[PDB]
Structure 1
Amino acid sequence: MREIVHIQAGQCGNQIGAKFWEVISDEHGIDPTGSYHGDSDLQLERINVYYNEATGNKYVPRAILVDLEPGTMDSVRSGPFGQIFRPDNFVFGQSGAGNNWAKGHYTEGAELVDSVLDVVRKESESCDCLQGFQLTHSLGGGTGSGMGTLLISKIREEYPDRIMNTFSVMPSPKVSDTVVEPYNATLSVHQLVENTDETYCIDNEALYDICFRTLKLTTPTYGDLNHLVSATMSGVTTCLRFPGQLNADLRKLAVNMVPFPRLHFFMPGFAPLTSRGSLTVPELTQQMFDSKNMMAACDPRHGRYLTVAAIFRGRMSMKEVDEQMLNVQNKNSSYFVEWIPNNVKTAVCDIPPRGLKMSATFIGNSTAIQELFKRISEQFTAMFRRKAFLHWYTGEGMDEMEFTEAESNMNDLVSEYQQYQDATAD
Structure 2
Amino acid sequence: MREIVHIQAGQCGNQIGAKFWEVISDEHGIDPTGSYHGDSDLQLERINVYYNEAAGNKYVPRAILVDLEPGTMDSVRSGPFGQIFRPDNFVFGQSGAGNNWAKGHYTEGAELVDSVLDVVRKESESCDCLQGFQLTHSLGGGTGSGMGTLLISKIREEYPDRIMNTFSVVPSPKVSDTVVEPYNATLSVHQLVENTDETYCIDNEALYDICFRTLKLTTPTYGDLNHLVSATMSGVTTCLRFPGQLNADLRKLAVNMVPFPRLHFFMPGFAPLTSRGSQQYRALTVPELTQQMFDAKNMMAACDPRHGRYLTVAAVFRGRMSMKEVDEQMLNVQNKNSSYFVEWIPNNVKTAVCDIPPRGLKMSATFIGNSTAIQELFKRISEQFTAMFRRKAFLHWYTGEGMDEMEFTEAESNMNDLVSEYQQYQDATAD
Determine if the TM-score, normalized by the shorter chain, exceeds 0.5.
yes
Structure 1 stretch 313-322 or stretch 218-227: which is displaced more?
218-227
Taking the aligned partners of 1:171 and 1:216, their CA distance within structure 2 comes to 24
Deviations 1:280-325 (A, max 9, x none): 2112101100011111111222111111111222233222222212
Deviations 1:354-397 (A, max 9, x none): 33223221111111111121222222222222211111100001
Q: CA deviation at 1:274?
A: 4.4
Deviations 1:147-175 (A, max 9, x none): 11011111111111211110111122756
Taking the aligned partners of 1:233 and 1:329, their CA distance within structure 2 comes to 25
Q: CA deviation at 1:209?
A: 2.3
Cα pair distance change 1:205/1:367, threshold 3 Å: same
Q: CA deviation at 1:398?
A: 0.7
Query: Does the 8 A contact of 2:289 with 2:365 survive in 1?
Result: yes
Q: CA deviation at 1:409?
A: 0.8
For the aligned residue pairs, the C-alpha RMSD in angstroms reads: 1.9
Deviations 1:199-246 (A, max 9, x none): 011112211222344444456432232222122112222222222244
Deviations 1:3-48 (A, max 9, x none): 1111001111111011111101111111111122222122222221
Cα pair distance change 1:175/1:16, threshold 3 Å: farther
Query: Does the 8 A contact of 1:46 with 1:243 survive in 2?
Result: no
Cα pair distance change 1:12/1:325, threshold 3 Å: same
Query: Does the 8 A contact of 2:319 with 2:357 survive in 1?
Result: yes
Cα pair distance change 1:178/1:389, threshold 3 Å: same
Please point out which of 290, 301, 309 is paired with 1:304. Answer: 309
Query: Does the 8 A contact of 1:175 with 1:204 survive in 2?
Result: no
Cα pair distance change 1:276/1:378, threshold 3 Å: farther
Where 1:3 maps in the other structure, the secondary structure is strand
Taking the aligned partners of 1:36 and 1:225, their CA distance within structure 2 comes to 27
Q: CA deviation at 1:275?
A: 6.3
Where 2:373 maps in the other structure, the secondary structure is helix
Q: How many correspondences in the alignment?
A: 426
Structure 1 stretch 220-229 or stretch 328-337: which is displaced more?
220-229
Cα pair distance change 1:174/1:213, threshold 3 Å: farther
Taking the aligned partners of 1:263 and 1:277, their CA distance within structure 2 comes to 40
Taking the aligned partners of 2:275 and 2:8, their CA distance within structure 1 comes to 25
Q: Which residue of 2 aligns with 1:409?
A: 414
Q: Which residue of 2 aligns with 1:112?
A: 112
Deviations 1:89-145 (A, max 9, x none): 110111111101011100111001100011011111111111111011011111010
Query: Does the 8 A contact of 1:45 with 1:243 survive in 2?
Result: no
Query: Does the 8 A contact of 1:174 with 1:208 survive in 2?
Result: no
Q: CA deviation at 1:53?
A: 2.0
Q: CA deviation at 1:341?
A: 2.5
Cα pair distance change 1:118/1:276, threshold 3 Å: farther
Where 2:247 maps in the other structure, the secondary structure is coil
Where 1:131 maps in the other structure, the secondary structure is strand
Cα pair distance change 1:93/1:366, threshold 3 Å: same
Runs of 4+ in 1 over 6 A off after TM superposition: 275-278
Where 2:368 maps in the other structure, the secondary structure is strand
Where 1:29 maps in the other structure, the secondary structure is coil
Structure 1 stretch 150-159 or stretch 347-356: which is displaced more?
347-356
Q: CA deviation at 1:266?
A: 0.8
Query: Which ranges of structure 1 fall in alignment gaps of 5 or more residues?
Result: none
Structure 1 stretch 204-213 or stretch 127-136: which is displaced more?
204-213
Q: CA deviation at 1:68?
A: 0.3
Where 1:242 maps in the other structure, the secondary structure is coil
Query: Does the 8 A contact of 1:52 with 1:62 survive in 2?
Result: yes
Query: Does the 8 A contact of 1:5 with 1:124 survive in 2?
Result: yes
1:344 aligns with 2:349: yes
Q: TM-score, normalised by structure 2?
A: 0.94
1:362 aligns with 2:367: yes
Q: TM-score, normalised by structure 1?
A: 0.95
Cα pair distance change 1:394/1:219, threshold 3 Å: farther
User: In percent, how many aligned pairs have the same letter?
Assistant: 99
Taking the aligned partners of 2:144 and 2:277, their CA distance within structure 1 comes to 30
Cα pair distance change 1:226/1:126, threshold 3 Å: same
Q: Which residue of 1 aligns with 2:43?
A: 43
Structure 1 stretch 42-51 or stretch 95-104: which is displaced more?
42-51
Query: Does the 8 A contact of 1:227 with 1:276 survive in 2?
Result: no
Cα pair distance change 1:304/1:407, threshold 3 Å: same
Structure 1 stretch 412-421 or stretch 221-230: which is displaced more?
221-230
Q: CA deviation at 1:183?
A: 0.9
Q: CA deviation at 1:404?
A: 1.4
The residue correspondences of 1:224-373 to structure 2 (distance < 5 A) are: 224-274=224-274, 279-373=284-378
Where 1:413 maps in the other structure, the secondary structure is helix
Structure 1 stretch 212-221 or stretch 341-350: which is displaced more?
212-221
Structure 1 stretch 61-70 or stretch 156-165: which is displaced more?
156-165
Taking the aligned partners of 1:162 and 1:295, their CA distance within structure 2 comes to 26
Taking the aligned partners of 2:17 and 2:274, their CA distance within structure 1 comes to 20
Cα pair distance change 1:173/1:308, threshold 3 Å: closer
Cα pair distance change 1:380/1:21, threshold 3 Å: same
Q: CA deviation at 1:336?
A: 1.7
Structure 1 stretch 209-218 or stretch 135-144: which is displaced more?
209-218
Where 1:17 maps in the other structure, the secondary structure is helix
Structure 1 stretch 244-253 or stretch 326-335: which is displaced more?
244-253
Taking the aligned partners of 1:204 and 1:310, their CA distance within structure 2 comes to 22
Q: CA deviation at 1:250?
A: 2.3
Where 1:155 maps in the other structure, the secondary structure is helix
Taking the aligned partners of 1:56 and 1:277, their CA distance within structure 2 comes to 44
